Amino acid sequence: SIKAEMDQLATEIDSIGNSTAFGNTKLLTGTFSAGKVFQVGHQEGEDIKVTVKAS
């Protein structure tokens, strides 16, 4: 009976990982494993990198 409870809790850790999205882009499934780039200046090279490992 205790395992039947642990088993379902692990299913949601999977479910949150595969659901969390920004409109339509999944953020916790490794597409941000190699940090993506945002440009915050007005010239080339002024970038910020955000890395989210798969969980």
Binding site: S1, I2, A4
Partner: protein
């Protein structure tokens, strides 16, 4: 950052009030009966053990 279409401060505030109200409700029913395991929300293994002890 002065908007009149979305109030995210309200959205976060609403969630906290709901959590505090639900905790108050569950405490009253435990006090009104005198049992920690009212439903299967609580210890899944506890109710199974208690049934055999009750027998």
């Amino acid at each position: 950052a002065i908007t009149v279409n979305t109030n995210v401060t309200s959205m976060k505030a609403q969630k906290n009030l709901n959590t505090s109200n639900s905790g108050l409700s569950t405490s009253m029913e435990r006090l009104s009966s005198g049992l920690r395991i009212n439903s299967a929300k609580d210890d899944a293994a506890g109710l199974a053990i208690s049934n055999r002890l009750n027998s």
